[PDB]
């Protein structure tokens, strides 16, 4: 995901796939650590033929200093080790930036060419 | 394959089998003898230029490598300084060499003109009864130019190629004598094509000079007797005659240029074919394990370079011989 | 007049900076969906161009009403329209070109984030600073020597030199199509087991090389035929012009002199013309290809390189007149030698009846001595000009290398693009050196052709022929 | 091979007219700059070999000068 400065980051979605037992799942959102801000909720359980279930943890981060912050979902389940299993993402907030030298010279070339055509 | 080889060798030898050109070139060398110090200086400067140009590439590559990778300002500055130093020296030597060659050409031209005029002044009067003044002047002002019209460029190219070919052949022998012997496939075809083209070229050059002499005689008669042509209202007639002579000259020029272009096309095709053959043979050897990839690339570079140098040597030598022998009168 | 025009221009600038900067992006973002940022940028650019063009038209109409003041203000206002067009269409054109170049590696930051760059004051200033010089150059070009006389000979042959140029361009394209379809050599030759890649690439390369060779053959044939026609036509014209003069023109100009001018000056002129024109056109086309590649590499450094070429062409412009005078003297001395030879060889009974072969030889030797003293200067100038050209191009390369190092340290240019640009800029500078070496040859050709063009342009000092042909006289 | 990094569009020798040039299989690697690099050749073939080859090349020209001087 690539956010913008002052714009609401997209609602991140963590998928926990094909685990049994259904109970005992702990999905925690972290900002890498500190707790990831943003309204976090959970989806219903989706059963499969083999009997395992899947869940979706949904996070809505608040409007977004930082340049390479990570939003991650950590899953703690009895079958997993004590550390659990995590899925992280990268955030970019460089939605605005001044024109580069290459862009300026390219604009000059475009102006020259379009004036030549006319 | 044996039948084909025997037939192709027989055809090449038939095409391959000059003394007049050699003696005229020796005469030109005798006439150029007084310019020996200038030629010595030119050769010295040529050698210095080649030696400097062998050193420039290392520092050019150092600069490129520094820019591409980690940028160390001190190394960048040192490489720039040495590249500039060697380029400066080589350019100075090249300029001196070119100036010396040009002055030698001019001196040879003036010497030719003086000797031809002093020889003409000694002839018997029947010689001047049997010849025309305009044509003599055309010889003295154009064939002398032809005799010395190539030294600055042809001499430089010949000497550079001569300096480089021996070393390149040594290197490619060091890598692979087998492929080095294979690479000699081009020489027969090169020499045969050069022989055919040189014969045609010399013939057409002589015809061109004759036509130029005829047109010069037309102008000579028209301008010398101006008051007589103008008293019969015959200027348009003289202009028509001159235009006919110029048309003949133009057709001869066109034949010369067309044949030269066709020869260049033929030798480009030969070069491409022989390079393809060499690449195929080297690839087969590399697959068989005889030589590695780096050796194959190095040998291809060296062998193509020597092929180009040998073709240039042959062509330039033939061109000098044609230019000298076209001024036979 | 002038005050009203300046006030209108200032008001237009302020309006563009205030309203068109911010209002238009909002309007075209609300009207256009977010799925087409390029469309938003194009719409904003077109709207800005239309507004500025309407303002310029209104200002021009207002100024035309009054004619009491000078016309310089109107001349300056004439560039308002191209400047507005540049301002409006600089960004959308670049965005369209970048989108069309690659569909998987967007440069972005212009087409997307449309309002973030239109309203960006930095981008506004950059667009104005880019549009000002382009508009200035376009207006200067639109508002619009012996070399012209020299080149006027190639008037009726344009339709054939154009074919020559087309064939040269086709050969260049075929030459460049080899790396773009077969890649680098090691990509296929070194791979062991190559059966569908070695043969394919080898055959494609051979076909392209053969096609380029045949195209060069045809172009060279066309060019040589055209140059032969030019040579013949010029010689005929010079001879006719000489014969159209008056009876005393041939008592001031002697037979050998006129003959040398007609037969020898024209031939040297034509040889120089052919050689240098072929060289110039070929290297011009290849330099344009190299410039395209360099622009692909780094646009900024390519512009920096193009800025400094006049600095390299300064000195030749100064020394061209010296070259012309030197060659004029050389031709005159050759003509005097021709006169001596013609006069001596036409009266041999008289020369021998007085035993004066030695005197004729001495006169010829004196003329040759003059020519020799001129040739010494020719050679020295050749050496010094070679030095100057080499040093100039070396300094060009060194300066570009230093600036590229500064840019790579500053992070403005990536290392790979910098290396590619440098490697192609070296070839570009070599071509520039070839052109610099051509320039003195053109000056010498002017010097050589001075007298024959004087003959051609001379006005005979005799009455023209009449029209009376009565049946009975 | 760093020579194959760039595509040669001009003739390797600029004093040769373009119409007289050869269309080479290996562009920018057979040019005199890429081939006759003193440091690379000394590394690959040894100092003695390169020096000997250059001496032989120069002695060819010395022989030509001697022949011209015999006249």
Curated annotation (Swiss-Prot), chain A:
<protein>
    <recommendedName>
        <fullName>Tapasin</fullName>
    </recommendedName>
</protein>
<comment type="function">
    <text>Involved in the association of MHC class I with transporter associated with antigen processing (TAP) and in the assembly of MHC class I with peptide (peptide loading).</text>
</comment>
<feature type="transmembrane region" description="Helical">
    <location>
        <begin position="106"/>
        <end position="118"/>
    </location>
</feature>
<comment type="subunit">
    <text>Heterodimer with PDIA3; disulfide-linked. Obligatory mediator for the interaction between newly assembled MHC class I molecules, calreticulin, PDIA3 and TAP. Up to 4 MHC class I/tapasin complexes bind to 1 TAP. Interacts with HLA-G-B2M complex; this interaction is required for loading of high affinity peptides. On its own or as part of MHC class I peptide loading complex, interacts with ligand-free MR1 or MR1-B2M complex, providing for stable MR1 pools ready for metabolite antigen processing.</text>
</comment>
<feature type="disulfide bond">
    <location>
        <begin position="14"/>
        <end position="73"/>
    </location>
</feature>
<feature type="domain" description="Ig-like C1-type">
    <location>
        <begin position="1"/>
        <end position="90"/>
    </location>
</feature>
UniProtKB/Swiss-Prot annotation, chain B:
<feature type="topological domain" description="Lumenal">
    <location>
        <begin position="175"/>
        <end position="180"/>
    </location>
</feature>
<feature type="topological domain" description="Cytoplasmic">
    <location>
        <begin position="202"/>
        <end position="261"/>
    </location>
</feature>
<comment type="similarity">
    <text>Belongs to the ABC transporter superfamily. ABCB family. MHC peptide exporter (TC 3.A.1.209) subfamily.</text>
</comment>
<comment type="subunit">
    <text>(Microbial infection) Interacts with Epstein-Barr virus BLNF2a.</text>
</comment>
<feature type="transmembrane region" description="Helical; Name=6">
    <location>
        <begin position="154"/>
        <end position="174"/>
    </location>
</feature>
<comment type="subunit">
    <text>Heterodimer of TAP1 and TAP2 (TAP1-TAP2). A component of the peptide loading complex (PLC), interacts via TAPBP with MHCI heterodimer; this interaction mediates peptide-MHCI assembly. Recruits TAPBP in a 1:1 stoichiometry. Interacts with classical MHCI such as HLA-A*02-B2M; this interaction is obligatory for the loading of peptide epitopes. Interacts with non-classical MHCI molecules including HLA-E-B2M and HLA-F-B2M as well as PLC component CALR before the peptide loading.</text>
</comment>
<feature type="transmembrane region" description="Helical; Name=4">
    <location>
        <begin position="36"/>
        <end position="56"/>
    </location>
</feature>
<feature type="transmembrane region" description="Helical; Name=5">
    <location>
        <begin position="75"/>
        <end position="95"/>
    </location>
</feature>
<feature type="topological domain" description="Cytoplasmic">
    <location>
        <begin position="17"/>
        <end position="35"/>
    </location>
</feature>
<feature type="region of interest" description="Part of the peptide-binding site">
    <location>
        <begin position="301"/>
        <end position="320"/>
    </location>
</feature>
<protein>
    <recommendedName>
        <fullName>Antigen peptide transporter 2</fullName>
    </recommendedName>
</protein>
<feature type="topological domain" description="Cytoplasmic">
    <location>
        <begin position="96"/>
        <end position="153"/>
    </location>
</feature>
From Swiss-Prot, chain C:
<dbReference type="GO" id="GO:0006952">
    <property type="term" value="P:defense response"/>
</dbReference>
<dbReference type="GO" id="GO:0015833">
    <property type="term" value="P:peptide transport"/>
</dbReference>
<dbReference type="GO" id="GO:0042605">
    <property type="term" value="F:peptide antigen binding"/>
</dbReference>
<dbReference type="GO" id="GO:0015031">
    <property type="term" value="P:protein transport"/>
</dbReference>
<feature type="transmembrane region" description="Helical; Name=9">
    <location>
        <begin position="393"/>
        <end position="413"/>
    </location>
</feature>
<dbReference type="GO" id="GO:0046872">
    <property type="term" value="F:metal ion binding"/>
</dbReference>
<dbReference type="GO" id="GO:0023029">
    <property type="term" value="F:MHC class Ib protein binding"/>
</dbReference>
<keyword id="KW-0256">Endoplasmic reticulum</keyword>
<dbReference type="GO" id="GO:0046979">
    <property type="term" value="F:TAP2 binding"/>
</dbReference>
<comment type="subunit">
    <text>Heterodimer of TAP1 and TAP2 (TAP1-TAP2). A component of the peptide loading complex (PLC), interacts via TAPBP with MHCI heterodimer; this interaction mediates peptide-MHCI assembly. Recruits TAPBP in a 1:1 stoichiometry. Interacts with classical MHCI such as HLA-A*02-B2M; this interaction is obligatory for the loading of peptide epitopes. Interacts with non-classical MHCI molecules including HLA-E-B2M and HLA-F-B2M as well as PLC component CALR before the peptide loading. Interacts with PSMB5 and PSMB8.</text>
</comment>
<dbReference type="GO" id="GO:0033116">
    <property type="term" value="C:endoplasmic reticulum-Golgi intermediate compartment membrane"/>
</dbReference>
<keyword id="KW-0460">Magnesium</keyword>
Curated annotation (Swiss-Prot), chain D:
<comment type="similarity">
    <text>Belongs to the cytomegalovirus US6 family.</text>
</comment>
<comment type="function">
    <text>Inhibits peptide loading of MHC class I molecules by transporters associated with antigen processing (TAP). Does not prevent peptide binding to TAP, but binds to the lumenal side of the TAP complex and inhibits peptide translocation by specifically blocking ATP-binding to TAP1, but not TAP2. Also prevents the conformational rearrangement of TAP induced by peptide binding. In consequence, infected cells are masked for immune recognition by cytotoxic T-lymphocytes.</text>
</comment>
<comment type="subunit">
    <text>Interacts with UL18.</text>
</comment>
<protein>
    <recommendedName>
        <fullName>Unique short US6 glycoprotein</fullName>
    </recommendedName>
</protein>
<feature type="transmembrane region" description="Helical">
    <location>
        <begin position="47"/>
        <end position="67"/>
    </location>
</feature>
């Amino acid at each position: 995901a690539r956010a913008a400065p002052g714009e609401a980051p997209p609602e991140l979605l963590c998928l926990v796939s094909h685990f049994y037992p259904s109970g005992g799942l702990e999905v925690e959102w972290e900002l890498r650590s500190q707790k990831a801000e943003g309204q976090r909720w959970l989806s219903a359980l989706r059963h499969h033929s083999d009997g395992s279930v899947s869940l979706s943890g949904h996070l809505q981060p608040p409007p977004v200093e930082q340049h390479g912050a990570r939003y991650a979902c950590r899953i703690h389940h009895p079958s997993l080790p004590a550390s659990g299993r995590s899925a992280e993402v990268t955030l970019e907030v460089a939605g605005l930036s001044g024109p580069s030298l290459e862009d300026s010279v390219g604009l000059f070339l475009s102006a020259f060419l379009l004036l030549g055509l006319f | 394959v044996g039948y084909g080889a025997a037939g192709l060798s027989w055809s090449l030898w038939a095409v391959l089998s000059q003394v007049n050109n050699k003696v005229l070139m020796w005469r030109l060398l005798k006439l150029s003898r007084p310019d020996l110090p200038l030629l010595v200086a030119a050769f010295f400067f040529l050698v210095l230029a080649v030696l400097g140009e062998t050193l420039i590439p290392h520092y050019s590559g150092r600069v490129i490598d520094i820019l591409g990778g980690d940028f160390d300002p001190h190394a960048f500055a040192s490489a720039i300084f040495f590249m500039c130093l060697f380029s400066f020296g080589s350019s100075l030597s090249a300029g001196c060499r070119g100036g010396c060659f040009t002055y030698t050409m001019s001196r040879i031209n003036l010497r030719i003109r003086e000797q031809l005029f002093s020889s003409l002044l000694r002839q018997d009067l029947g010689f001047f009864q049997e010849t025309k003044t305009g044509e003599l002047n055309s010889r003295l002002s154009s064939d002398t130019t032809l005799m010395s019209n190539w030294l600055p460029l042809n001499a430089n190219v010949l000497l550079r190629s001569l300096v480089k070919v021996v070393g390149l052949y040594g290197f490619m022998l060091s890598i692979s004598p087998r492929l080095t012997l294979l690479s000699l496939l081009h020489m027969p075809f090169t020499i045969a094509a050069e022989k055919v083209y040189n014969t045609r070229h010399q013939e057409v050059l002589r015809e061109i000079q004759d036509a130029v002499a005829r047109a010069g005689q037309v102008v000579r008669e028209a301008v010398g007797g101006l008051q007589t042509v103008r008293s019969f209202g015959a200027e348009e007639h003289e202009v028509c005659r001159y235009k006919e002579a110029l048309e003949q000259c133009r057709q001869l020029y066109w034949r010369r240029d067309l044949e030269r272009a066709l020869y260049l096309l033929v030798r480009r095709v030969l070069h491409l074919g022989v390079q393809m053959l060499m690449l195929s043979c080297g690839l087969q050897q590399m697959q068989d394990g005889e030589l590695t990839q780096g050796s194959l690339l190095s040998f291809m570079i060296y062998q193509e370079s020597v092929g180009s140098y040998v073709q240039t040597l042959v062509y330039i030598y033939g061109d000098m011989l044609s230019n000298v022998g076209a001024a036979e009168k | 007049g002038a005050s009203l025009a300046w006030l209108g221009t200032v008001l237009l600038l302020l309006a563009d900076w205030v309203l068109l900067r911010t209002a238009l992006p909002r309007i075209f973002s609300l009207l256009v969906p977010t799925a087409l940022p390029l469309l938003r940028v194009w719409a904003v650019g077109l709207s800005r161009w239309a507004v500025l063009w309407l303002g310029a038209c209104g200002v021009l109409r207002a100024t035309v009403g009054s004619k009491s003041e000078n016309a310089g203000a109107q001349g300056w206002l004439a560039a308002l329209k191209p400047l507005a067009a540049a301002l409006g269409l600089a960004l959308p054109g670049l965005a369209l070109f970048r989108e069309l170049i690659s569909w998987g590696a967007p440069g972005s930051a212009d087409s997307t984030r449309l309002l973030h760059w239109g309203s960006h004051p930095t981008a506004f200033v950059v667009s104005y600073a880019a549009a000002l010089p382009a508009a200035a150059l376009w207006h200067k070009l639109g508002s619009l020597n012996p070399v012209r006389r020299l080149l006027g000979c190639l008037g009726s042959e344009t339709r054939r030199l154009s074919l020559f140029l087309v064939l040269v361009v086709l050969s260049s394209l075929g030459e460049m199509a080899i790396p773009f379809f077969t890649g680098r050599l090691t990509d296929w030759i070194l791979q062991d087991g190559s059966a569908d890649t070695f043969t394919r690439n080898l055959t494609l390369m051979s076909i392209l090389t053969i096609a380029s060779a045949v195209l060069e053959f045809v172009g060279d044939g066309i060019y040589n035929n055209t140059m032969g026609h030019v040579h013949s036509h010029l010689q005929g014209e010079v001879f006719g012009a000489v014969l159209r003069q008056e009876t005393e023109f041939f008592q001031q100009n002697q037979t050998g002199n006129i003959m040398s001018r007609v037969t020898e000056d024209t031939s040297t002129l034509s040889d120089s013309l052919s050689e240098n024109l072929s060289l110039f056109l070929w290297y011009l086309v290849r330099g344009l290809c190299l410039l395209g590649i360099m622009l692909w590499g780094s646009v900024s450094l390519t512009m920096v390189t193009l800025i400094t070429l006049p600095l390299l062409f300064l000195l030749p412009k100064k020394v061209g007149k010296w070259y012309q005078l030197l060659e004029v003297q050389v031709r005159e001395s050759l003509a005097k030698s021709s006169q001596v030879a013609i006069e001596a060889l036409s009266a041999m009974p008289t020369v021998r009846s007085f035993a004066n072969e030695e005197g004729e030889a001495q006169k010829f030797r004196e003329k040759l001595q003059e020519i020799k003293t001129l040739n010494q200067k020719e050679a020295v100038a050749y050496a010094v000009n070679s030095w100057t050209t080499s040093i100039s191009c070396m300094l060009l390369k060194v300066g570009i290398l230093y600036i590229g190092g500064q840019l790579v340290t500053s992070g403005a240019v990536s290392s790979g693009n910098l290396v590619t640009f440098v490697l192609y800029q070296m070839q570009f500078t070599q071509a520039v050196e070839v052109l610099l070496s051509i320039y003195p040859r053109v000056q010498k050709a002017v010097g050589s052709s001075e007298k024959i063009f004087e003959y051609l342009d001379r006005t005979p000092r005799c009455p023209p022929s009449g029209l009376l042909t009565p049946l009975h006289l | 091979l760093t020579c194959q990094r760039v595509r040669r569009l001009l003739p390797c020798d600029l004093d040769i007219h373009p119409s007289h040039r050869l269309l080479t299989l290996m562009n920018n690697c057979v040019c005199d700059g890429a081939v006759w690099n003193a440091f690379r050749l000394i590394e690959r073939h040894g100092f003695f070999a390169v020096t000997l080859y250059l001496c032989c090349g120069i002695t060819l020209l010395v022989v030509i000068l001697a022949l011209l001087c015999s006249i």
